[PDB]
Amino acid sequence: TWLTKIVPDLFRTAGNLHRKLIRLSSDLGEERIANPRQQLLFRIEETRNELYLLVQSHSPLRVDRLGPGYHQMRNLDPLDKGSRVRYRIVASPTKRLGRSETQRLTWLRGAAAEEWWHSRAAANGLELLSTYAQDDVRDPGTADRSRKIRHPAVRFDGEAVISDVDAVRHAVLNGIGRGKSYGCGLLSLALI
DNA sequence: CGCGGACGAAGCCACCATGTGGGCTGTCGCCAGGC
Structure with a gap:
């Protein structure tokens, strides 16, 4: 997996949060099993302004329009x-x-x-x-x-x-x- | 030498007072339930 600290700007709703997480990743995959869990994950950390958020992910994120002024990102293996x-x-x-x-x-x-x-x-x-x-x-x-x-x-x-x-x-x-x-x-x- | 322009020639008369005014504007909490 790999971890990043990212922050959307203008967030009015939760679904647009989802969409802002998928539009910065082109090649996406989905491996599913009938009943088990699907195989990004994410946590909302500061929501009144913009919205800082910690993302766990498989595919690499790069800043988009109105993103950060930089690509933090680390790739981690447990x-x-x-x-x-x-x-x-x-x-x-x-x-x-x-x-x-x-x-x-x-x-x-x-x-x-x-x-x-x-x-x-x-x-x-x-x-x-x-x-x-x-x-x-x-x-x-x-x-x-x-x-x-x-x-x-x-x-x-x-x-x-x-x-x-x-x-x-x-x-x-x-x-x-x-x-x-x-x-x-x-x-x-x-x-x- | 002729014509045009400019200048000149007058008649002139002289102890103490101040006050007016009045016309332009916009706002939420959201969602759910019941009537």
Whole structure:
């Protein structure tokens, strides 16, 4: 993978955030499996002005119109088990259930979000997830370009001893939780 | 030598007072639900 610090300017909506992330990468690929996760990822870091954002990626980004005045960028290749390292992350805990008139949506509170998350990591890296328990988007009018929704993210943080390296790294590259294209998924680690 | 231009010749009369005015303008919170 490879990491960059980038910052869009004029961002009014989340979908245009997605599009500004894909229009700077020409050769794009998508390798999918029926039920498993798709194989960029990204995290919103400062949103009231322009919008600074950390991107994880496979294909190299170069500045575009109204981009940075420079191409930071580093290419990284990943992490010994038993050792603790800093984590991080935004995701959307949900419960899907039959809806009157299907619906994404202990169990809310800060304890089934912790249950949900450590479910997400599973045998990979053991961690503690900052529990949130509370973003809107609409289509920019372009045909076949989504529509309008709501949503709710949660950020999580600390050091996460990993129990399987290739598989937590697998999780780092695949992403944790739905809506990866709308801010979620990216797990960030650092040595303790 | 002739014509044209310029200049000249007058008749002239002389203790103490100040006040006016009035005419041009635009703004949100967003989304969802119910009537």
